[PDB]
Every structure is written in structure tokens, then in C-alpha cells.
Symmetry: C4
Subunit: 322 residues, 4 copies
């Protein structure tokens, strides 16, 4: 069976045979947004520069763009469309070098400077706001949360437990962090219904609230494999044959970014290590604890790990008493 | 009985016989906001343009707007109110073509350029901020979350279950997604109290946390109809007669928009299909799983579905043993 | 005993014998912020206008502010401090009428235009950002959520229940809404410890998740008074004598404002009505349900309501069987 | 054993042997950001000022920068690189004194004013947005939430309870506040696995939802030490010998800042006071309750507090009955 979720967290699914303006600004690439706005300015500057040029022609300002004791142009020094364009830039950008300067003569020209300024003012606001939308809502978010490459199975305090490690790469904390885990596989119900990919919970302590982690130094996430586990009947010899996936999730409000995140990784049946345990990454030093993230993913063998399933172990203790 | 909630999610209720400035900017329509600001500019530009015109009259600048070796206007080239208005625009917009230029002579005129600039500066800030308020808080949000048209009833693993499908239209994930469901109907209590529309929970697994979904490919939301269900006594023959509504809800933090959402749909008793199951939309391909959203809403008959209620089925197994 | 919480939601507590720059901008009043910034501009404009004036003196520009074939001022037309000030405004506001125009002569003056522009640019950014801080984080939030004036006690489906109504004033929904309730009173422990105001939970269905409301039309919030209630032994005759408070809370993410809210109200023992029920505000109309918020707070007598406590009622049924 | 968490809340851990642009702007210090932008302006202003200077040379504007009846410079009064630089500032800042004014002659110069304006416009937006990023996401957040210096152990209503006080310093409320507590210590499993710092929950009422606090006046956080506690076997005589840490956490959405917070403090075994209770900080006044935060941290002896562990107390009542 192919993967649903990849190690990085990416979901491996394609939609087929299937928008708000705000959200689309956050989607469109940077260079396409910066293009898109540059277009919005020209579209305005030309439009207006043209309006100002039309006005400059009808009033006869192209023949006498300076004016004199009698004649007075609507806008001074608009001798052609280039100057009409330059004025329109200078008015909306509000550079306004002033060589081309609007005069009192033409009420339309006055109205048109007014309109352009508001238009120009509205355009800028949208651009500023469009950008912090894109900055504050980045589709590339660095992977502050690290997952181990492998989950493992081992004995903790007399119970068989699937385990995987989660670790924070930034010193910035994660507020209200809580883990989940799911077994992903296709199954057919007792009434012969095919479920393409049935998602089945792997309990990590939601009922007592132990799924709530305080992640400072990398924590190992336990899952007791017992009656109510879906790995209950699965032994090490089954693990090689069996073909399932285990999605591990860590949701949390990350104070670095100030927005909630959903960390993701996957462990296929063939990525899980029976009879293994992780290398301690937290070490005592007189002054200060230190995490060494080089040993993060590393494990070691535990030969004294039962090769049979959790059920088998349960079934043995009942029979030895008889 | 008329509907409370529509298929789109809209609530069908009217308030009768019943504000912050920030929230009202998010309500007022765009064209009314853009009008509203355009007004705010004129109100200022005229106001100031008038103040500058009054000053230009009293100081005698309308008779000699250029000045000479002796006489020096407060602001140059303010020959009328048009030029006084143009100066006020040019000062607050900060275009400042400079033909109309404030001079050193009048301390009031100097103060008035100062005031206007700050006023103009404050106005712009409010406009920029008013707009990203409106962008970041849109009252039209695209329906990223899709609900099936029909819920259905069928047998899963030996239990009678009401089911409805939920699906994500964007590839963007939904963080901390969790489902609810409610049966909406008027009822009268045993002490003769009329409840216009009593909202009654339809359990989808809140107690063990199975109401938490990891929605990548469209999930079917189960509700086991058992002792504690309100559909417990309801059989297929009752379904045609009975008149109730079932609101289905999916709340979740949508990372596309970065704000929490409440997806809504409704299933009236006459919209629920007894003896049906949904068409698989997830299909195996060697490279990559694919969801086909054309089969999203579609179902098929299951004649082997018990036409009696969940209670009836329970009552049968007790009697066959005797 | 005096009140902890008022009807509006305000908390009645004073701190005695007890900051970030961002949060303090959200606290300081508007007129003090707008003052504060106006000061920030003058402080800069004067400062710079002075620097430019000093430069204009040392270079000898006050005697020949125009210049000629030989002499060329650092900045033209800075004949006094007024013009030096006007230039500094015109440079930082970037009006720049241009009558006072920086020239090539003085590298210091050139540096000083550069510095001022960046300073001016940084100042504006802070002002824009300071304002949307204040807009987006308003300390006055309209009371979209309405609480009834009175809680009541009555029989629902064979159990004695304290009840209070909550209602949404805007059509805008409240996402992930959930209720709480607390009994507030001073008490002394069995080991003689005085607790000034012991906060004690009044259960409204947190354990099964019924505390989660879908508030469209005003809901009545039930509290079953049973063994585990603190109103268990309290009868109607005790209610007049007893002196306690009941804080009712509704937290929820309000999509109108897009920020979480904590609605608050209080019911003192003397504000609770034994033997009463609320007036139906939802009415059936052929087209569309309608809530009438004029009957929101109103109740009616129920004489058939047991005047004894919930415990008494429990104690009666045990004794009638014997 | 050294500390994991300090009294202030700081975590005492170092990462060794181990980014998005948005988040890095929130990290970089202010003076380095303000430097960084000042650089961004010069880099542009020089770049463009150079481009304009190159153009001014090739067209021959340095020999005749004014122009005449025949010759007309691309940009007027660009006599050197200083004026070419001044023009580039005046164009991008949009001061545009206008002495140096772009003319119609050179289409390249016209294009270059256009490019610069958009570039300048894009730069400003990024700066404004970069700043409110830094303001809205401060790494220094004032400690609105106060923790007691010491936890204590004492008897409440017939049970041995570890207790610590939490208090709100601002009058601004904390929405959806909920407490946690953890015992931090290294331990070795029954299968000989060393856990550097095993985090173990100290129950404060998550299962019934009593971990949800409504913090107005400073609350004391109880932890019943019973069978399921990790302080169950620990007596006062053990407390001096034992070496463990107790991290206390309060997460909550703080309406002052409008962002979720994670308050932290620690109590080492040697910081906990057996046989003590806190000083009442809430006092009755006719008008208004008052909290006095001077008595916040203070306690008093309770000699009638059992010096033995909670288990011992349990073991005594079983034996006295026999
Ligand atoms: K300008
Ligand atoms: K200008
Ligand atoms: K100008
Ligand atoms: K000029
Ligand atoms: K100018």
C-alpha cells in the first residue's frame, strides 16, 4: 500500500473532478503578486495620464503649455502624453515635482486630481495589507517540531508500548501542545463494506489528559498496546508481513509564530523497530541541562523484548496460574 | 416544521424587538466604506482649504498673491478659494506641487500646515487599518468544507448508525477539527413545558475523543444508534412520518484562512436515506492516492439493511435466547 | 455579602499594594495616544529644523539664502528658523514644496535629509501600527451575548434544575461556545480555614460535553440539582435566608470580532426565582422562525413547583416505598 | 539535581548539535532591524541614484544640466552624482523638491522613475509590516500572571493536598484559563531504562474540569495527594531528603494581549512548605472587595498538620477499625 502521509508531514492525496479575494492573495506567488500590483499602478497611471492628456488637448494646452497673461492651461507643462503621464504619476505617487502643476482654470482637472489621489490612496492601502496578509500567513513554515524517523516497540513498566519521539527545535515554547496517533489502512466491514483508508485511533492518553505534553526537552510518546489497541494481536513476526501506516500528529499553539500548527509524520509498519529504545538526548551538567539533537533519531537493541504480541503476553499469564 | 439550518449552513432565524466602531467597519459594505473615507478627505480638504482661504483674505493675499519686495503672502499663489483648496489638498495628500507654497510670514498659516499634516497622517492610518480589518475579517468565506447532501442509516460492524460525509475542498489542512451533531425539534416536557426548538445531542464520539477527525480525504461521520441515541426507537417506517431536523457541525482552525470556522449543514428527516451507503471517493493508484469529488454525494442501496429501529434489533436478540 | 460579578459582567475587585510597550499603546486613551504622536512629530521636526538652522547659520545662508554665481546655500531659502522648520516639516512629511530645497553643497545637510527621511518613515510605521493595535484590541466590546436578568428553579423531566437563558444579539455566530457556572461564597473548612470567596462549580454538563452549546436562538442553560450539586439541600424557604452568588459564564470564539470572548453575568440568591419558567421567544412562522427579544427576560409562575429542596424530594421517594 | 524550570518561568535547557523570513523579523533585535531597513533604502537610493547618474552622463546633462532652446536633460539639475543621488532620494521617498525634476526627453529615465516608485512603494510596505510583526509578536511579555514563591502541603476537608497560588496582576481577564502541574525527576524503569527527566502529571482536576479556573482574585490550586498521586508515599521527613521538582503551569487566552500565554513557575522539593497555608489576600469591604497583593506569597504555620505521608494517614484508618 502507498503512503498517506510522508515523513516531512506532507499529505499524499490528489483531488479531482471537484474563492475569497483575501485567501487568494495568500496563495498567489510573491513575484505574481508584485507583478499584479505593478500592473494595478500602470493601469491607473496610464488611465489618468490619458484623462489628463485628453483634457490638455481639448483646452488647447499642447500649443501653449506654459500659458501667458490671457491663456492658462488646466495643468502646466503638459506638452504631450509623456508629460501628461508624468503628471499622473507625480500626482498619484504624490512625488509632484511641480514642473507639471495643476492650475485653477479647469474644474474637471481639479476633480481629476482629487479622484486620482483617493484612488492612489486606496491602492496603496490594499498593497500594504495584501503584503502582511502574505507575510503573516506563510505557506512555507519552518519545521520547528521534529519527529523521530522511527517509532519503536518496547516494554515500559510491564506493558508493551509503541513509542515515537517528538522534539522542539526552537527554544520558543509550544502552548497547549497535545499529541494524537492514528493507524491508517483499508479494511472491509463485517457487512462487506470496503473502506479505502480507515483511520483508527492509537490511544496516547486522551481520557486522563496525558496526551497533553509540556515539550521543552524531546519527549517520547507512549502508546500502551493492550486489549483496546489495534496493535494488540500484532507480534514482531506479524510486523514484517503486515502492511499498515501510523500517522503521528502534534498540534499546538506555537508562540514563535503565534498561530496554531499541526505537526505530522508517518511510520509505515516497515519503519517501526521491534525491540528498540531511543538514545538519551538530555544530559546532566552541573550548571545547565543540555539536549544533544545528534542522538535524537538513534536507538539501541533490547534483546530482552518479547517477540510475541501484547495479547500473547496477556494469554501467557492467565495460563501459568492454572 | 420549517428549517432551522439550510444545506449551505445558513441559519434560518429572525431577531425582532431587540456597537463598536471596529466591528462596524467590518460590517459596512465596501462601496459604503470607500464612499465614507472619500467623504472624510473632502471634509478635511475643504475645511482646511477654507481655513487657508480665510487667512489669504484677511492678510490681503488675493490682491497680491505673488508678493513683492515688501508684501509677502502667508501662502503663495492662493489667488482664490480654488487655489486655497488646491493648496490644502497638496498639503494633506503631501503632493505639494509647490506653486502654491506656504511662506514664513504668517505663524497661523504655519501652525495650520502642521495641524493638517498630522490630521492627514492620522486619517490615512485609519483608512489603511480599516481596510485590513475588512480583508482579514471577511463576511463571505468560501466553503472550503463540504457536507454530503444526505445522511444515511446503515449497519457498520453490527450496529445501526446514522452517517454523513465531510470533505475538505482545499488541500490546506484543518487543525484541531472536531465534529458535532444535533437533533432539532420542538418538544413538550413531562411537566407540560413547550420547548419551541429543543436541541438534543447526537453523539459522534466526544467521550473517547473520536469526534476529533484528521480530515485529509473525505471522512464518513458515524453515529451509533443505541439506547442513548434519540433515533433509538425510530425505524424506517417512522422516518417517513417523523418530522425532525439534524444539524451537522464541523468546527476547526483552517490554516488557509488562519481563523477558526464553523461548518454547517442540515439533514431533515426526509433527507436521510435508510438502507444506503456512500460511494468510495478515495482510489488506489500506484503512485498517489486520489479523491474524486464527483462521487462525493452519491450512494447505493443496501437491501440487507434492517427496516426496523435499533431498539427493535436489540429487542430481537433478547427474545431469541429465551 | 457584596457582589463579585455585576449583571453587565464587570468584576467588582480592587488590587492594592501590587509593562510591555505594545500592550500600553492598547491601554492609553485615544486622545492621549493622538497627543503622544503629535508630540513625536514636533520633537522630530523641531529637532531637525534646528539642525538645519544651525547648518544654515554656520555656512552663512541667512545672509544670502538664494545664493549666486559663487555662493550656494546647503538648503535654499532657509532665511530664518521658521524656514528651517518649514524645510524640516516639508522633508519628513515629504510635502517638500521645494521653495526651500536641499542643494549639493553641504554633505552634512545631505546626510541630514537622509536621516530625517528614515526617521520620518519609521515614525509613520509605528503610528499606523499603534492605531490598528488599538482598533483590533478594543477595551470596549459591545455585549453581543445577552444573559437573562434572573436564573430560575423549576422541574424539567422529573428533576429540579437551576436555569438561566443566554442569547446572541448579532446574527453572527459564536464558534466553540461553551458554558460554565460557579457558586461564589465565603466558607470555612473542617480544619478551620477561612476562604474569603470559595469558587464552587455548578455543573452544566461538562462531562458528556453538553456544556457545548450551538447558540442560534436563545438557549436555556440547565443545571440539575442533585446529590453532587451545591444547591442540593437548598429549598425555597432557604433561598430567602441564604446569601450566595452564582456567576454564569459563556466563553466562545465570536466570528464578528474574530477573537475569543468571556461573557459574564451574576445571579445573587435573591435574584433567583423559585417556581418560574421563561417566556418562549422562538415562534413558528410558515416562512421563517423568529426570535422576539422583548420576552427574553420574562418569566411566568409555576405553582406546581415543589417548594422543598432537591434532597427533600429525593428523601420522599425512598420513604414512600417503605 | 539542577532545575528544569526557574521561578520566573524560564526553561533551563540548551540545544546542541541541532527558517522563515517572517519569524526571523520577529527574532532579530530592534536596532538590527532598523539598521537592516536603513541599509535597504541606501542600497536602493544609491543603486538608482547611480542609474540616474549614468543616464545623466551619456546624454550629456553634466555639461548643460539646465538645458536651453535645443538641449533638454533627461532629469534637470543633475550636475553631478550628488544631485543624481538627491533626485533618487526625492523620487523614492517622494519628497521631490522639484529642482531636480524628470523631463520628457529620455524614455529610459521615465521608465526608471516608474520602477523606483514601485520599488520604493514595495519597500515601505515591507517595513510597516515588519514592524507590526515585531510589535504584535513581542518576545518580552510582562508577567501578568503571578505564581506564589512556595507551594505548601496541608489538610483541606479531610485530605492531604499540595497547594500553590496563582494571581492575575492586571484587571484584564484571562479567558479559558486552565492549570496543570507536573513532577519532574529522572527515573529508571523496571526494565532498567534510564529516563533523564521523566515528566509525571500532578492532577489538579482535569477529569471533572475543575482544572478550569475563573481567575479574578488569586486562586489557590489544590492537588489531592491520594493513591494516584506521586506524592502519595512522601511524608515531611521524606521531603527534606527527596530531590524532585514541581512545574506549575497556567495556560490562558489573555484579553489584554489577545494571544494565548503559558505561565510557568517551579517548586523544588526544598521550596515546598509542609504544614503551611497562605495569607488571605481578599478582604471584605462594605462597598468593594479588595485584593492586597502584599500578602500574596505569605503563609502561616499549621502545627496540627500530619507530618506523615498521605498513604500513612490512609493506612492508619484501616488499622484502627480492626
Ligand atoms: K509625498
Ligand atoms: K512632494
Ligand atoms: K513635492
Ligand atoms: K517646485
Ligand atoms: K515640489
Amino acid at each position: 500500500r502507498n503512503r498517506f502521509v510522508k515523513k516531512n508531514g506532507q499529505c499524499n492525496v490528489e483531488f479531482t473532478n471537484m474563492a475569497d479575494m483575501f485567501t487568494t492573495c495568500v496563495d498567489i506567488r510573491w513575484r505574481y503578486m508584485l507583478l499584479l500590483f505593478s500592473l494595478a499602478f500602470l493601469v491607473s497611471w496610464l488611465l489618468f495620464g490619458l484623462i489628463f492628456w485628453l483634457i490638455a488637448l481639448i483646452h488647447g494646452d499642447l500649443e501653449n503649455p506654459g500659458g501667458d497673461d490671457t491663456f492658462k492651461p488646466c495643468v502646466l507643462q503638459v506638452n504631450g502624453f509623456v508629460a501628461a503621464f508624468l503628471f499622473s504619476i507625480e500626482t498619484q505617487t504624490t512625488i509632484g515635482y511641480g514642473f507639471r502643476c495643476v492650475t485653477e482654470e479647469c474644474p474637471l482637472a481639479v476633480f481629476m486630481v482629487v479622484v486620482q489621489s483617493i484612488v492612489g490612496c486606496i491602492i496603496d492601502s490594499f498593497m500594504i495589507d495584501a503584503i502582511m496578509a502574505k507575510m503573516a500567513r506563510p505557506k512555507k513554515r519552518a519545521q520547528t517540531l521534529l519527529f523521530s524517523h522511527n517509532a519503536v516497540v518496547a516494554m515500559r513498566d510491564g506493558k508493551l508500548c509503541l513509542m515515537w519521539r517528538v522534539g522542539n527545535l526552537r527554544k520558543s515554547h509550544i502552548v497547549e501542545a497535545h499529541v494524537r496517533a492514528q493507524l491508517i489502512k483499508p479494511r472491509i466491514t463485517e457487512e462487506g463494506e470496503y473502506i479505502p483508508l480507515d483511520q483508527i485511533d492509537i490511544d496516547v492518553g486522551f481520557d486522563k489528559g496525558l496526551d497533553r505534553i509540556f515539550l521543552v526537552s524531546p519527549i517520547t510518546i507512549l502508546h500502551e498496546i493492550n486489549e483496546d489497541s489495534p496493535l494488540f494481536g500484532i507480534s514482531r513476526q506479524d510486523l514484517e508481513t503486515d502492511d499498515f501506516e501510523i500517522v503521528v500528529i502534534l498540534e499546538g499553539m506555537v508562540e514563535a509564530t503565534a498561530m496554531t500548527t499541526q505537526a505530522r509524520s508517518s511510520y509505515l509498519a516497515s519503519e517501526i523497530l521491534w525491540g528498540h529504545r531511543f538514545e538519551p538526548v538530555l544530559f546532566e551538567e552541573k550548571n545547565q541541562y543540555k539536549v544533544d539533537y545528534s542522538h535524537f533519531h538513534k536507538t539501541y537493541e533490547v534483546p530482552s523484548t518479547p517477540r510475541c504480541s501484547a495479547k500473547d503476553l496477556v494469554e501467557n499469564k492467565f495460563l501459568l496460574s492454572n
